Design a protein around this ligand. Structure first.
Ligand code: 263
Length: 162
């Protein structure tokens, strides 16, 4: 297991435009296209991201290309965020993957309210962090995924992903 395999499990792979858990147009391995309710707008974003007229369909290779970009960009972002970098740097590689997973799903703005969880993670208070992480919209809306990510933070193992 690693961050790519972990997110592939959590996000799936679909080659046609679909709506994510929040109802937003998405393709590939959780590549968010836009929050616009306009399918035409999503198709434009897709064509821009891929560099050809896709008509809303891509290949597995193209999906994997966007995915690698999205994972890389999520990491680079964390490192650019003064609140997130110190916690990320304090973690082992397995828990870093859990961190990347959350930022991939919700963005840096999506984790702005996780200040108290972040402190507990920095303190390596793993069971307390795990309890705090679940007191969230995130957990309530996507509990099965959140349970996997939280177990990863709690244990520093890949047990939740087999
Ligand atoms: C950079 C980073 C470290 C640990 C967790 C998260 C996700 N949000 N929370 N808690 C981000």
């Amino acid at each position: 297991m690693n961050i790519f395999e972990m997110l592939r499990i959590d996000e799936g792979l679909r080659l046609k435009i679909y709506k994510d858990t929040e109802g937003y147009y998405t393709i590939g391995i959780g590549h968010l296209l836009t929050k616009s309710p306009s399918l035409n707008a999503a198709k434009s974003e897709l064509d821009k991201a891929i560099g050809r007229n896709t008509n809303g369909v891509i290949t597995k290779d193209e999906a994997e290309k966007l995915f690698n970009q999205d994972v890389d960009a999520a990491v680079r972002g964390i490192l650019r965020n003064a609140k997130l970098k110190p916690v990320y740097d304090s973690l082992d590689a397995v828990r870093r993957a859990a961190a990347i997973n959350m930022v991939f799903q919700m963005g840096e703005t999506g984790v702005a309210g996780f200040t108290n969880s972040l402190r507990m993670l920095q303190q390596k208070r793993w069971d307390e962090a795990a309890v705090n992480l679940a007191k969230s919209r995130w957990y309530n809306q996507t509990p099965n995924r959140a349970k996997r990510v939280i177990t990863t933070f709690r244990t520093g193992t890949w047990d939740a992903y087999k």
